[PDB]
């Protein structure tokens, strides 16, 4: 339906979204330290987002 | 101590939090795969929030 299912598909997105602009903040604060955790958390956002497509992959009813 | 660290440090707490809420309700969205990467991200979101207590060592969720 493209509805809910992108809903959950946006969180998922949303919160790689967090997580880059984690990553600047912590730069910003010399944070290599949390950056580098923040990027493998980036991917890991993305791996929740990225299934959340496999499920929720209905993305294209909506034209 | 600074405020940036506080809010860095609440990002990191704040995915994690967050990803919770995913975990449960995207459970409930029959997307248990999703649940499944959100407990991992879940305290991976953590991570961020552990290497901020301890480069920062700033926490006080206070106004």
């Known amino acids: 339906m493209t509805k809910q299912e992108k809903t ?5 997105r949303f919160i790689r979204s ?10 910003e604060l010399d944070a290599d ?8 958390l980036h991917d890991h ?3 929740l987002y990225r299934s959340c497509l496999a499920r ?7 034209l």
Chains 1, 2 share one sequence.
């Open 8 to 12: 959950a598909l946006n969180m998922a």
């Open 18 to 27: 967090q997580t880059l602009t984690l990553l600047e903040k912590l730069n």
């Open 33 to 40: 330290e949390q950056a580098d955790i923040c990027e493998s």
């Open 45 to 47: 956002a993305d791996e």
């Open 56 to 62: 929720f992959g209905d993305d294209g009813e909506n």
